[PDB]
A paper describes a structure:
In the course of analyzing the structure and interactions of CTLA-4, which is providing important insights into avidity enhancement of regulatory signals at the T-cell surface, we crystallised and solved the structure of an Escherichia coli-expressed monomeric form of the protein (ecCTLA-4), which unexpectedly formed a misfolded dimer and both amyloid and amorphous aggregates under largely physiological conditions. A monomeric form of ecCTLA-4, which comprises a canonical Ig superfamily (IgSF) V-set domain, was engineered by mutating the cysteine at position 122, which forms a disulfide between the C-terminal membrane-proximal linker regions of the protein, to a serine. Immunoglobulin (Ig) light-chain protein deposition diseases arise when Ig domains form pathology-inducing aggregates; these can occur in a variety of organs but most frequently in the kidney. Our work provides new insights into the stability of immunoglobulin folds and the process by which they form disease-inducing amyloid-like deposits.
As expected, this construct was expressed as a monomer, and its crystal structure revealed the characteristic V-set IgSF fold. Although only one molecule of CTLA-4 is present in each crystallographic asymmetric unit, an unexpected swapping of the C-terminal β-strands between adjacent ecCTLA-4 molecules results in the formation of an artificial homodimer (compare the topology diagrams in Fig. 1b and c). The GG′ strands of one domain replace the GG′ strands of a neighbour, and vice versa, forming a compact dimeric unit. A structural comparison with the native, non-strand-swapped crystal structures of B7-complexed CTLA-43 and mammalian-expressed CTLA-4 (maCTLA-4; Yu et al., manuscript in preparation) which forms a quite different disulfide-linked dimer, revealed that cis–trans isomerisation of the prolines at positions 101 and 103 relieves peptide bond strain in ecCTLA-4 seemingly driving the strand swap of the C-terminal β-strands. As well as this reconfiguration, new van der Waals and hydrogenbonding interaction networks between the amino acids forming the (opened) hinging region appear to provide stabilisation energy for the strand-swapped ecCTLA-4 dimer, alongside the formation of the native-like β-strand interactions between the GG′ and F strands. The strand swap seen in our CTLA-4 structure is strikingly similar to that found for CD478 and also that seen for a llama antibody variable heavy chain, which was hypothesised to provide a basis for understanding aggregation by Ig domains. To investigate the possibility that the strand swapping we observe could underpin additional levels of aggregation, we incubated a concentrated solution of monomeric ecCTLA-4 at room temperature for 24 h, whereupon dimeric and larger oligomeric species formed. This indicates that purified monomeric ecCTLA-4 ectodomain can refold to a relatively stable strand-swapped dimer and also produce larger aggregates.
Numbering used by the authors:
A (entry chain D), B (entry chain D): 0 to 120
The structure:
């Protein structure tokens, strides 16, 4: 596991419809085979998992049935939406982003060593 | 698969005991979980596999039972020996080196977005 910075807006005001949107950006190396986003909520020191989705870099996010969250990946971004919010749902919403890549594999082929063996008697 | 250069001596003279030794160097990225060396022989255009061994970077090589080949890995090197050679065993001996690494995995944890939700009436 290598650490990765994730940036997101410090504060967001949910609309009167109770829809809140924010972006979580990160500095990835390249095209991750997998990318898994998880939103956690902190209030009263208690941390809960609000939602989780997995997808391939570029391909669209999709959360579990009737999720609070909607999502859209565009490059080194995930654009989260969270709906149905009410007053008591105020708190700190944290992005956890996992990127997974294929195992490196190197093949080297040498030019050859001509081995000469003596025929004695 | 990424290509990798492998260098080895152009010519080697087997001793009167029929023991021939050569080094196959390569430019690897780092500590490969796996490293697999394979020696191929070319004569009359025909290519045969003379021997194969697998090991971890640093840890010692060991070939199949009663192998022609003996081996020792030291950094970015494999030091091959080949014994029991006779005249007809003259030919081009090629190093094939495979390096395998673990799948990259990045975890990013955001600082959080404080979401404020309005209590209406």
């Amino acid at each position: 596991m290598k650490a990765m910075h994730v940036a997101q807006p410090a504060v967001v005001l949910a609309s009167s419809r109770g829809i809140a949107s924010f972006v979580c950006e990160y500095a990835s190396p390249g095209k991750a085979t997998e990318v898994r986003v998880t939103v956690l909520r902190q209030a009263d020191s208690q941390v809960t998992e609000v939602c989780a989705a997995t997808y391939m870099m570029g391909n669209e996010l999709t959360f579990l049935d009737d999720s609070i969250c909607t999502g859209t990946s565009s490059g080194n971004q995930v654009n989260l939406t969270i709906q149905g919010l009410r007053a008591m749902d105020t708190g700190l919403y944290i992005c956890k982003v996992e990127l997974m890549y294929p195992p490196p594999y190197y093949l080297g082929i040498g030019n050859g060593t001509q081995i000469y063996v003596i025929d004695p008697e």
